[PDB]
From Swiss-Prot:
The modification Phosphotyrosine is found at Y186, Y188. The modification Phosphoserine is found at S46, S101. Changing L33A: No effect on interaction with BCL9 and CDH3. It comes from Homo sapiens (Human). This is Catenin beta-1. Phosphorylated by NEK2. EGF stimulates tyrosine phosphorylation. Phosphorylation on Ser-46 and Ser-101 by CDK5. Phosphorylation by CDK2 regulates insulin internalization. GO terms for cellular component: adherens junction; apical part of cell; apicolateral plasma membrane; basolateral plasma membrane; beta-catenin destruction complex; beta-catenin-ICAT complex; beta-catenin-TCF complex; beta-catenin-TCF7L2 complex. Key downstream component of the canonical Wnt signaling pathway. In the absence of Wnt, forms a complex with AXIN1, AXIN2, APC, CSNK1A1 and GSK3B that promotes phosphorylation on N-terminal Ser and Thr residues and ubiquitination of CTNNB1 via BTRC and its subsequent degradation by the proteasome. In the presence of Wnt ligand, CTNNB1 is not ubiquitinated and accumulates in the nucleus, where it acts as a coactivator for transcription factors of the TCF/LEF family, leading to activate Wnt responsive genes. Also acts as a coactivator for other transcription factors, such as NR5A2. Residues 11-33 are annotated as: Interaction with BCL9.
Amino acid sequence: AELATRAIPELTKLLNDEDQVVVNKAAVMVHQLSKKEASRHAIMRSPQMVSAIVRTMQNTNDVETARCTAGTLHNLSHHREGLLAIFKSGGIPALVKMLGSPVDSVLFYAITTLHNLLLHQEGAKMAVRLAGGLQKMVALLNKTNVKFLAITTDCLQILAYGNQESKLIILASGGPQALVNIMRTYTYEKLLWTTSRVLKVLSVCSSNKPAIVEAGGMQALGLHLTDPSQRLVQNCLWTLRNLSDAATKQEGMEGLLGTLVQLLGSDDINVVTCAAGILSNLTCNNYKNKMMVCQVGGIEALVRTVLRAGDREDITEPAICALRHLTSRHQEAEMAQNAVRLHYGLPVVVKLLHPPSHWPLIKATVGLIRNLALCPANHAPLREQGAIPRLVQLLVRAHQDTQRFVEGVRMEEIVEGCTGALHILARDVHNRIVIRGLNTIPLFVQLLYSPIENIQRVAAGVLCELAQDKEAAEAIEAEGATAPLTELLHSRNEGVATYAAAVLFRMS
């Protein structure tokens, strides 16, 4: 401090210079005063010099002058008050101006001083946003030095987190495409982890997610699912899960779907839950993805996941959902319906219909059972496992709650799913004796009166399969169903009209 606190007032005169060359020879001096801790603890001390370093750094059109001036601000950036000094000096907009400077060396001090400001200085995020540094940081994502890219992506992550307007600026600045490029072309873990944190923050925005998917983000995140760094894989999985609802049109997912299946066998419950969630979303409405997941043993992996998950519905509900997807509207679905039985899946699926399962899990499980029931080899084991009495009790109770949303599930979807499962199970003659013995024919006739056209179709279809037996056909008639079936014959839904025409013919 000798040649410091006391060396301060002379340095204020040595900072401010009017000559385009004496302030240059002064700036390279101030850099030397920045390299010594004693002299920079004096630069931190008085705010006059700090404003002059910031001013002359804006004024200078010489690269070397701008470097030592920024390196000075960098050395002040290690000190807590140095930050407060740059905050007073208004250097944040000045530092932003050099995010467009070309020489690398000055970019590296500026993005670091801004980084330390965003971490330890209060209100710094608001100042960088006002200065338009967000758009300058996204443009910097094209540079090549990985240590520089790791700091820039972190600055964007601290700024975008919890701020929806910062996320929309990153979108408008082409951020999604730039961040995805970083994931495809670099192997440095610190940068890839930070970039995935940015994409994770952008993944929850309704506008950013389609653009990330458009840029190939699903495939880019898939490349790092095999990485030994847990924080990288986990953030990739969290990000993949948020975008997976918008990626039903993407192709080239063969590698991702194969890795996702292996991740189901993982011991990390967060890894397993995410992989089950992504696979469930990507297999929806995508026949090609259904084929691939089945081609890499996905049914067997999902059945093992549901067995290992037990009572945790964070795992079973997506894994059941994915299983219901892979068992319908898809080429090798008949082999998938059998595969569930072959891997001892039928007992656990029926179990998930009983407590303590919550209604969302029950919805998927009933849907899974309809698809499994399409395979005749599943008719007898589903009956032996006790599926028909339980589906009937769920249907009866759900129908009373409709006459008089639970867990986000409307009971009318329980009514429709349970009647649909019974519709397919009723193809087997022994299931029809069980369904008939439960005195379900009444309730089925009531469902013909239901306003939901899908509930009318499953109700008329199950009565149609039942009406092929003589004893049952008389019971449907005695139930008075001949009159609703007449109004059903003239329905906008075909399926409602044809099933009503079939039962009517069966009653003779």
